[PDB]
Symmetry: D3
């Protein structure tokens, strides 16, 4: 598939998501990096988002709870180039009912080539990276040509 | 889980999705019922959408292609009460790349209790039902109450 | 591929299956439509079946419980043209051990093109549909042609 | 859970199933042990069963093809205690459409505790075992106590 | 695909694994077969292995707990040809977090064609089989040729 | 549960894995950062490894091909604390036979909290991160305590 470029802005649109057993883990991480995160645009699934705004006082755009469709809402935003970073702490030790949604979301994040962290170590590596606070160009699939070839 | 209601408008917002090996099967179903479908509002994933509007002249609100995010866009619309009927002809004899997206879409449609058809027989029954062209209430989960329980 | 036709009888052979968290929904639905379900022949997996028979007094041919093989028994009956309608309320908010059995059953229902409802709205539309109490022809794959093409 | 006992007959009801890329393997295996297999009752999925009977002249009770519902037909027979042994050479290297049916089939063979082989090595150890031609007691879930528990 | 052969030594390297609900079963099975098992080399996942040695006094090479990587460690050993027999009593009635690991390990055992038992009935037939203590040749995929093709 | 800590050495042990449709993408990424990667220890699955070394002349500890067990070999080393970073470019637009193996590897990489990149953007952010060349502490599950409770 042919590729094209997209610019991730200096102020990132970050999606924050965590399963219940990983919530306290995501909360700790968000709290120790708050000064930095307060500089970007935050999005989150329903429960996670409300817990964060409650604990940190930061402004978060909360979507629907994951099981109720929040996961796919974030997925759609990503496919629309509305999300630049995805922090998804899914539980690797307890199966969830929205497992397909979880896999679907990660699949799309892979496809659209945006930075993705599924654990703390990766999250720290990402936010400490130089281009986290600067604009940078990434290579994304050329959807227009992808679609055109589908209709030939 | 506490339930509430939502009213499906007389002119239904119908999403039409089909995997490649099912596109001809969907095309034919749409042509056979065009006189009826013309009275409603059509949505579809990228490829399916363009193939239809071209072969019938009907106006279809085409989202991104399934693999590229279309399925999740539809799922999001469903969870937001913007889609009232789902017609999804997925291939039952051929694994696909966006299988998780497929399962996640069907799960949400189940959750939000909207009429869903995954084959021709079900689609025919739904479309021939008396209230297909009428406003009718459906029971939906009470998100607000559901969320509160979560933040407690 | 290669398709032929089957005629669903006026007196439908209906399979009723529900996951625990959805059993009350199914039960209520059955009670509200007992007059009509009174006619037609009813089948069900173990637990679901006995509960219905025990609360409504209707005759129900109960198979093994889902986890014990009931889903596959229904599946087999469908592929053998013994089931005409499938009412399957699977839980979209909880994971189950017989998940593959569930997906397998829905795959076969799709393949054999019979009316399938996975939520109340879909069930209501199918049962309210005019040709629900009539003989209706459905397009089904021609197994003979399919098998012949396998042993070429 | 409650467990009771069942006796596997001296003369076993064997189910033979193989995916397309494993068919030649199953065929050879069958040919090498034909004299012994002819002493038992043979069952198979559509394609597999015909290929075997056409090549060996053996009497095989062929079910529908796997993708068309044969796997579930076998699963049901196992759950009903009509299949005592399962030889299923599935393909661990290729896609395969009826994947859930495959997992569901193996799930039931595990649940109902019957000898199961998914490769030649295991198939050989099983058929060469001293009690392959004898009656053998196996522990199986006690459905009665299971269902009774599910109710009341 | 090119196939070659490997010889399973007379003294087998057995891997023993069991999900929680099946541990008691495996334990008892091991004790009733302790005489024969002592003549072999035993391996097991963290929890399973410790319980066994702490009850039978037998020497068991315990890997990591399954959910922590045990299943994959066993998987690697098999592909490396260091495991000859796999006795894996996985829970067919309860969803586990390491589900993919479970499936991946079973996939590999199938690929490398080693004797595998997933229930007691199969475990008994395999262990009593004549060549369980003899050196036996098995067909395995010829990796050397398989790799060479990949690099053409 | 109980978490302990581990220190990734300044000289990282990097695992490189890619599905066929992503190999060209990984090669390009590798050569683009060869100067830096040259200072670290590289590991990879069969095909990927050979293709890399045979192209850059860098030393690569190649494992078996993914479908043949290499995915689990890598997963095993990660769980053993031998792999510090994982670059896994899996195909998001094409389903693979060793899919369970793929998910299991990703699951373990999540549990053991190591930096994980599934696309180029994530890989670049990690490798461009300042502490990529420093000794860094990461929180990991306290296995000892974990196992202790299991045997309480």
């Amino acid at each position: 598939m042919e590729l094209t470029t997209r610019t991730l802005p200096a102020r990132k649109h970050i999606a924050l998501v965590a399963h219940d057993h990983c919530k306290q883990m995501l909360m700790s991480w968000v709290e120790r990096h708050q000064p930095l995160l307060e500089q970007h645009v935050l999005y989150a699934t329903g429960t996670t988002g409300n817990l964060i705004s409650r604990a940190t006082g930061m402004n978060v755009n909360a979507m629907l709870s994951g099981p109720m469709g929040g996961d796919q809402q974030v997925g759609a935003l990503i496919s629309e180039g509305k999300i630049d970073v995805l922090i998804f702490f899914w539980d690797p030790l307890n199966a969830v009912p929205n497992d397909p949604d979880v896999k679907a979301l990660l699949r799309l994040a892979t496809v659209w080539n945006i930075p993705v962290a599924t654990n703390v170590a990766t999250a720290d590596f990402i936010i400490q990276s130089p281009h986290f606070n600067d604009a940078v160009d990434i290579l994304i699939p050329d959807y227009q040509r992808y679609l055109a070839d589908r209709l030939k």
